[PDB]
Short mmCIF file of C-alpha atoms in Angstrom, two decimals:
data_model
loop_
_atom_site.label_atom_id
_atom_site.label_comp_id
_atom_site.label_asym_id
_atom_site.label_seq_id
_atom_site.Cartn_x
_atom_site.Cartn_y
_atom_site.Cartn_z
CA UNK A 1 131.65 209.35 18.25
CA UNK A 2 132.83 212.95 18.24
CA UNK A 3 133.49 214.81 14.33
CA UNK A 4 136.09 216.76 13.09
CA UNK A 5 134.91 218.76 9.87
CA UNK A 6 137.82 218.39 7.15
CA UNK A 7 139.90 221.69 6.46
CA UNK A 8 138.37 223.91 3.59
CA UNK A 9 139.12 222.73 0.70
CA UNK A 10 139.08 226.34 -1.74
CA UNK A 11 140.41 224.56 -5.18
CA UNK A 12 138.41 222.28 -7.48
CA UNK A 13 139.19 218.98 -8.85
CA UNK A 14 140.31 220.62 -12.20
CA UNK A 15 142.37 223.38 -10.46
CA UNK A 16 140.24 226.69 -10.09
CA UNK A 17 139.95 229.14 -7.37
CA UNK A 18 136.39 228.89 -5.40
CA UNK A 19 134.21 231.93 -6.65
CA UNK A 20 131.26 231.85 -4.38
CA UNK A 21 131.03 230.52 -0.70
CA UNK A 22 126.75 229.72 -0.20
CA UNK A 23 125.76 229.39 3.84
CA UNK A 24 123.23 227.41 4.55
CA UNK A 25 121.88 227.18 8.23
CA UNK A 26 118.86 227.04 10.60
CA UNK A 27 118.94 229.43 12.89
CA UNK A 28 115.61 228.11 14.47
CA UNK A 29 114.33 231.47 15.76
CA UNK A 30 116.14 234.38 14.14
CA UNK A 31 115.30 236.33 16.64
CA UNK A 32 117.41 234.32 19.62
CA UNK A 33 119.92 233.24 17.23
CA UNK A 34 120.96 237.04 16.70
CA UNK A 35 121.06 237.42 20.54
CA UNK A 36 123.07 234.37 20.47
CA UNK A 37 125.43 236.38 18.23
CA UNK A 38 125.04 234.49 14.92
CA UNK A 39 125.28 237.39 12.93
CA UNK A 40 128.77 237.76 14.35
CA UNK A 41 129.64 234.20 13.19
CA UNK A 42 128.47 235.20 9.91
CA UNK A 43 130.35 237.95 9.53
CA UNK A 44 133.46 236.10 10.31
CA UNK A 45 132.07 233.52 8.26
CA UNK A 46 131.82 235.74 5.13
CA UNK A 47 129.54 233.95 2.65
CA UNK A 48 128.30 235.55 -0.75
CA UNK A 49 125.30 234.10 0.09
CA UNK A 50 123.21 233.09 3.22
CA UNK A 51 120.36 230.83 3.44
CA UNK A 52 118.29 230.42 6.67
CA UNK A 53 115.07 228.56 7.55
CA UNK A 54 112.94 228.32 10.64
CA UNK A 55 113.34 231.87 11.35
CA UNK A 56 110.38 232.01 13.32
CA UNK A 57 109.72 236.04 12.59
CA UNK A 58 107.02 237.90 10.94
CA UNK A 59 108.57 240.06 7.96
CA UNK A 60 107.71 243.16 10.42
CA UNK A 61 109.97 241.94 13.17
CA UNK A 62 112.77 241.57 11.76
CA UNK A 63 116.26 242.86 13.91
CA UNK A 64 117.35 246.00 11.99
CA UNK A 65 120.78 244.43 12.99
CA UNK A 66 120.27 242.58 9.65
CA UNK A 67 120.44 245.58 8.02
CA UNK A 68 124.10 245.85 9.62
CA UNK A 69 125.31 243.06 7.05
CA UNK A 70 126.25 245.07 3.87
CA UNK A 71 127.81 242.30 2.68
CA UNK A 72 124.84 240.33 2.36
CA UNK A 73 122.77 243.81 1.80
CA UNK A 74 120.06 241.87 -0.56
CA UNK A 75 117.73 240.63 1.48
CA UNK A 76 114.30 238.17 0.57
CA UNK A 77 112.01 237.06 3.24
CA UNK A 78 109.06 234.37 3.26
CA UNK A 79 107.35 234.04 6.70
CA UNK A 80 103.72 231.73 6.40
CA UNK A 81 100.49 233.58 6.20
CA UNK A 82 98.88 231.23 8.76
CA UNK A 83 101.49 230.64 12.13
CA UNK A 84 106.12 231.82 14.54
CA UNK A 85 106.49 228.61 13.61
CA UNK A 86 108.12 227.99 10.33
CA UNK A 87 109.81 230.97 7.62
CA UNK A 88 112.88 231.13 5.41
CA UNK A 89 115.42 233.49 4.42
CA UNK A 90 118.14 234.27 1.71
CA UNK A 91 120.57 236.86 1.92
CA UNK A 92 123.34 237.63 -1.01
CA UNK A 93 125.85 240.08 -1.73
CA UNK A 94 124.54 240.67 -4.87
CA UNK A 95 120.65 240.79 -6.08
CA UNK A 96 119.53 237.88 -7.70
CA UNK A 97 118.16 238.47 -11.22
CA UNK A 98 114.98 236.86 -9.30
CA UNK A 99 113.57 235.80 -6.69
CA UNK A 100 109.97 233.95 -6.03
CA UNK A 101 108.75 232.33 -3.24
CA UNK A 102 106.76 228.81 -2.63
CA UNK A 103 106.38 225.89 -5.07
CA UNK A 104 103.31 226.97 -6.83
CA UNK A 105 100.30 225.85 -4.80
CA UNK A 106 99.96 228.45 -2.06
CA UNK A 107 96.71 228.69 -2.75
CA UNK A 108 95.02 227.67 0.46
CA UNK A 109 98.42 227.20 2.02
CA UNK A 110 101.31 229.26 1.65
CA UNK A 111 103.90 228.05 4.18
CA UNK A 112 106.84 230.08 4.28
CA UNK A 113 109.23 227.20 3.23
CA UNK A 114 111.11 228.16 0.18
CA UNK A 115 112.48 231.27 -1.61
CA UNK A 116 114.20 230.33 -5.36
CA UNK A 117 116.61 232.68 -6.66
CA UNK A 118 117.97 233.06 -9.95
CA UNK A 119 121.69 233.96 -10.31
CA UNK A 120 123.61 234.49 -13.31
CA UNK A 121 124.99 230.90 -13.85
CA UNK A 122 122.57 228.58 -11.89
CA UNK A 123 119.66 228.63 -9.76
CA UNK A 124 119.43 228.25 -5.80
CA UNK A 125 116.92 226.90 -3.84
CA UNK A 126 116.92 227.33 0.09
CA UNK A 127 114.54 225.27 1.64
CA UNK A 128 113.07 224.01 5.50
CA UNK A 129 110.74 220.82 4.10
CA UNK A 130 107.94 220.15 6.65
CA UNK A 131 109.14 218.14 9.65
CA UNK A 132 106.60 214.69 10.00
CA UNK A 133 106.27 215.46 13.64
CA UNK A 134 105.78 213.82 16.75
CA UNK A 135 104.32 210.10 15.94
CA UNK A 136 104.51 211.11 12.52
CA UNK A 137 101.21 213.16 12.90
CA UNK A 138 102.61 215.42 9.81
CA UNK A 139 103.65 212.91 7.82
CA UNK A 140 100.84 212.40 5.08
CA UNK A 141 101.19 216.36 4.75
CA UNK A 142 105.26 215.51 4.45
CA UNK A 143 105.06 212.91 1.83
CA UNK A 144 102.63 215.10 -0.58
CA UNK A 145 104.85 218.14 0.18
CA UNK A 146 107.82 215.69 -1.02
CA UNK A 147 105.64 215.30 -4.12
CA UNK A 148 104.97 218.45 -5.22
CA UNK A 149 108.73 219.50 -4.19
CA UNK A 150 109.98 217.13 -6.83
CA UNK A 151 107.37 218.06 -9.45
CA UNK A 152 108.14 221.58 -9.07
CA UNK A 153 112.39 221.44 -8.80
CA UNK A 154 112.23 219.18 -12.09
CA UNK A 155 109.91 221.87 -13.97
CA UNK A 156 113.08 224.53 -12.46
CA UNK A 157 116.60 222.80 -13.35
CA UNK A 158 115.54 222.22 -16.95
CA UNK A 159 116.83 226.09 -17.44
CA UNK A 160 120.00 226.51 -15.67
CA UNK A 161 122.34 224.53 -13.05
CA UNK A 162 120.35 223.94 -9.49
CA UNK A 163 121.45 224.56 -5.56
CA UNK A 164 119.68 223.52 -3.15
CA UNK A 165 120.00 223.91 0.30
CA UNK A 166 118.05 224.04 3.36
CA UNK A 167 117.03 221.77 6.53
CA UNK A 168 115.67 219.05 4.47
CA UNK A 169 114.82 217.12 7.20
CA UNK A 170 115.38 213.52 6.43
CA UNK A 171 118.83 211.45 6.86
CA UNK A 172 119.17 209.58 4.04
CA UNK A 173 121.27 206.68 4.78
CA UNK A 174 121.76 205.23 8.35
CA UNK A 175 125.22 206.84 7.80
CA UNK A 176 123.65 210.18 8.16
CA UNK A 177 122.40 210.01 11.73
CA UNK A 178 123.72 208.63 15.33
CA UNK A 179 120.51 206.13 16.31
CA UNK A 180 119.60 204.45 12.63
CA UNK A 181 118.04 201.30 14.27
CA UNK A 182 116.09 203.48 17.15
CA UNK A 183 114.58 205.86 14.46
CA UNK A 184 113.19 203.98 11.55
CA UNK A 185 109.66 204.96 13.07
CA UNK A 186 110.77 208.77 13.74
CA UNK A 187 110.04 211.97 11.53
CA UNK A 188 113.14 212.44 10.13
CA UNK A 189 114.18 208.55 9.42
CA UNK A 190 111.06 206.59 8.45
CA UNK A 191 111.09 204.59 5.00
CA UNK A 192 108.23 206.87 3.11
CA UNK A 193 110.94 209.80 4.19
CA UNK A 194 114.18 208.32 3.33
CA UNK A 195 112.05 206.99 -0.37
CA UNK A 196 111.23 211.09 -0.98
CA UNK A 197 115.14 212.30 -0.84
CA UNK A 198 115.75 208.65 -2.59
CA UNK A 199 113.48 209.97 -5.37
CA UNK A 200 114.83 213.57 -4.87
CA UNK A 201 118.32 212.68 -5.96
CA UNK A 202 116.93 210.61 -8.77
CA UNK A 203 114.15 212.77 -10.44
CA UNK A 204 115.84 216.27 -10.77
CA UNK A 205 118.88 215.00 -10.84
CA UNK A 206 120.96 215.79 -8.04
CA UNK A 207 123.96 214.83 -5.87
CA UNK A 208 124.80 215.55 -2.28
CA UNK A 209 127.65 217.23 -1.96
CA UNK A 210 128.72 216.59 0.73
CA UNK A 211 128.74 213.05 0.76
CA UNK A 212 129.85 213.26 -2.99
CA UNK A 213 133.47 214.08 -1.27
CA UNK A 214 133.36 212.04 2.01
CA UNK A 215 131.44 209.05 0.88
CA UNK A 216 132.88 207.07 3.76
CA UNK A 217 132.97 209.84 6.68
CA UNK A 218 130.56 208.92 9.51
CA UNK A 219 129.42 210.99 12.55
CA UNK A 220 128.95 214.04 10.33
CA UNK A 221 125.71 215.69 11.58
CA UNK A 222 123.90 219.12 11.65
CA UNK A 223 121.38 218.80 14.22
CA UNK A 224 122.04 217.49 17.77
CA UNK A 225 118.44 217.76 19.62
CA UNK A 226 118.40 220.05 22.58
CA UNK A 227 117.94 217.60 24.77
CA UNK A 228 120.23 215.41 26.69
CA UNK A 229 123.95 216.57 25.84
CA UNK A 230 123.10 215.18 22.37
CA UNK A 231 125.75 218.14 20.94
CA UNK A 232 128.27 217.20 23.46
CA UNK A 233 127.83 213.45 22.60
CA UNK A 234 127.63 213.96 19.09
CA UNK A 235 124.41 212.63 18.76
CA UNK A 236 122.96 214.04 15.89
CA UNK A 237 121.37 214.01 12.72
CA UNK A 238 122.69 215.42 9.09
CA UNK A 239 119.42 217.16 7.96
CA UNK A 240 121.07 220.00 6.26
CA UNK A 241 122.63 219.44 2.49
CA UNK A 242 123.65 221.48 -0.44
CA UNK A 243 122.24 219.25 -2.81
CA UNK A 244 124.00 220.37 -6.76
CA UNK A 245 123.22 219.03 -10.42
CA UNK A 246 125.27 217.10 -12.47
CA UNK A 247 126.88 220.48 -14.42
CA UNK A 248 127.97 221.43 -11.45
CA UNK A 249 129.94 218.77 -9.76
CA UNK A 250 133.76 219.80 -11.45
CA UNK A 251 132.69 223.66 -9.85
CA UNK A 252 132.59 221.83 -6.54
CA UNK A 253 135.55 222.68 -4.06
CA UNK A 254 134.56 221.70 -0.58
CA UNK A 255 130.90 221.20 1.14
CA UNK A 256 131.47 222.01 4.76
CA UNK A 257 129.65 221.34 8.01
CA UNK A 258 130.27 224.36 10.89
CA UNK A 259 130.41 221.82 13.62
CA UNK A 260 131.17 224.11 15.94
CA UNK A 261 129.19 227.05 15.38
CA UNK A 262 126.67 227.57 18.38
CA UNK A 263 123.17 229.26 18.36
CA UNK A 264 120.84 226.92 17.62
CA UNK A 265 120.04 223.37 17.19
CA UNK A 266 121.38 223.17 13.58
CA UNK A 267 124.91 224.15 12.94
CA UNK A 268 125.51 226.15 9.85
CA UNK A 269 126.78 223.99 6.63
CA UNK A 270 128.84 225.79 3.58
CA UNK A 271 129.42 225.56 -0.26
CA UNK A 272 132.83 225.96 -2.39
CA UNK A 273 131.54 226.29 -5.98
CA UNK A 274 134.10 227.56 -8.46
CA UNK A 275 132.33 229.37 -10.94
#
């Protein structure tokens, strides 16, 4: 039941040193995840770049204790203009040749969700995709969100290599959660959900990276619910991927999941791209 993360693997297939180490993690509520000393776990952590979603902070609140991570001393911020209740982060060690923020329709709208930043070899997406909700009362919003996602990621990687990380909020496969059977009706695990990151992988195209490696490894999760000792019995859910292009699968080294990184009800997940 329990999961042991694999040992970093900092080589690729074809033999070259991992460039650039990409954290991905939901921190859900920046604000009590830095009191819950996730900036420390970063720093040990060391990634060129961090991603984080569900931050739950106006841009004006933010801890000037971010501003204590020179290593990640770039900083881009998209909170929603209507909520704390959803927002996104990225943080790099070096500035992006750009950055924008949504997928195009914000008029009327304008969530918070993504930030897409251009680098000098590829392009990263961080993203927290609407949850369906409770009794799926989201989940017509979800599946048009899904939509438009696609539509606007495919009209992105026709330039340069895509990354794309984020709390994506769907297990794909009944491999990628604890309960398959006593979820097929919950946000998260219904068929309309698992058909969008289906059609994700698809459309764009994409792989997950993490199953790319470990095909076969079960019990690998990134969100244990609060409730319960779901953590303690590794009861979980993977709903946080670094999802890569084609072009960019011999770069991969490793695609890690922080098991036991505390702070929130996501765990942190990281990349090994050699670039």
């Amino acid at each position: 039941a329990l999961y042991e993360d694999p040992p970093d693997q900092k080589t690729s297939p074809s033999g070259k040193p991992a460039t650039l180490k990409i954290c991905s993690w939901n921190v859900d509520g920046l604000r009590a995840w830095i009191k819950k000393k996730g900036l420390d776990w970063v720093k040990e952590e060391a990634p060129d770049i961090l991603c984080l979603q569900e931050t739950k902070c106006s841009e004006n609140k933010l801890p000037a204790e971010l501003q204590e991570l020179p290593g990640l001393s770039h900083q881009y911020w998209s909170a929603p203009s209507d909520k704390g209740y959803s927002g996104v982060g990225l943080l790099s060690r070096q500035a992006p040749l750009k950055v924008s923020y949504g997928i195009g329709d914000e008029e009327h709208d304008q969530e918070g969700r993504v930030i897409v930043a251009e680098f000098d070899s590829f392009v990263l997406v961080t993203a927290y995709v609407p949850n369906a909700g409770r009794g799926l009362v989201r989940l017509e919003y979800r599946q048009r969100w899904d939509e438009a996602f696609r539509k606007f990621l495919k009209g992105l990687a026709s330039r340069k290599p895509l990354v794309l990380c984020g709390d994506l909020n769907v297990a794909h496969e009944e491999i990628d959660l604890r309960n398959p059977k006593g979820n097929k009706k919950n946000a998260g695990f219904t068929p309309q959900e698992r058909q969008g990151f289906g059609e994700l992988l698809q459309a764009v195209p994409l792989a997950d990276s993490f199953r790319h490696l470990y095909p076969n490894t079960p019990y690998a999760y990134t969100f244990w619910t609060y409730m319960m000792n779901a953590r303690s019995k590794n009861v979980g859910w993977r709903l946080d991927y670094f999802l890569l292009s084609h072009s960019l699968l011999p770069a991969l080294c490793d695609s890690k999941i922080r098991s036991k990184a505390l702070g929130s009800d996501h765990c942190p997940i990281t990349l090994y791209l050699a670039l």
